Homo-oligomer: A and B are copies of this chain.
Amino acid sequence: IQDLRTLNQTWENRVRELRDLLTRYASRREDSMSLGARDAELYHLPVLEAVRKARDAAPFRPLAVEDNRLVANSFFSQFVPGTESLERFLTQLWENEYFRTFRLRRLVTHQGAEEAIVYSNYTVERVTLPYLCHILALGTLDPVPEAYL
């Protein structure tokens, strides 16, 4: 009787734990109030209230899988990817592509500071003049020099 009662208690505890793990409805109904303006309000109202709200706004949800045996050897992987290292490759890809297709002139001053970037004499011939020869009127208009542009 003592062992059966203990087993029943264990089973009840197991059922409660399983129910807590499975059911997420309570969480779904919770935090409905939270929206963008409350987030701004966090800064506006006391920080401590916000901290308490955050504490219960992202609840401690464990992770578990039933196994026949109590075997578990664990590791952790903190990670980010380096998005900055190849953004400055794609930005310097676009600029190193469009300055080879259409060869746009840059105006640089002392201590190498780049200023605004103008059309060449080549690209106006390469993209605007074919817009003039088959899309617009042909055979009368002359192309502008680069500095005059």
Contact = CB atoms under 8 A, between A and B. Distances in A.
Contacts of A22: 18, 21-22, 25
A89 B99 contact: no
Stoichiometry, copies per complex: 6
A147 interface: no
Nearest to A65: B62
A70 to B, nearest CB: 6
Contacts of A82: 80, 84
A48 B70 contact: no
> Which one of A11, A31, A66 has the greatest number of beta carbons of chain B within 10 Å?
A11
B33 A46 contact: yes
A14 interface: yes
Interface stretch (A52-60, A121-129, A134-142): A52-60
B33 A48 contact: yes
A71 to B, nearest CB: 6
Nearest to A78: B77
Contacts of A62: 65
A116 interface: yes
B5 A68 contact: no
Contacts of A39: 46-47
Nearest to A77: B78
A10 B68 contact: yes
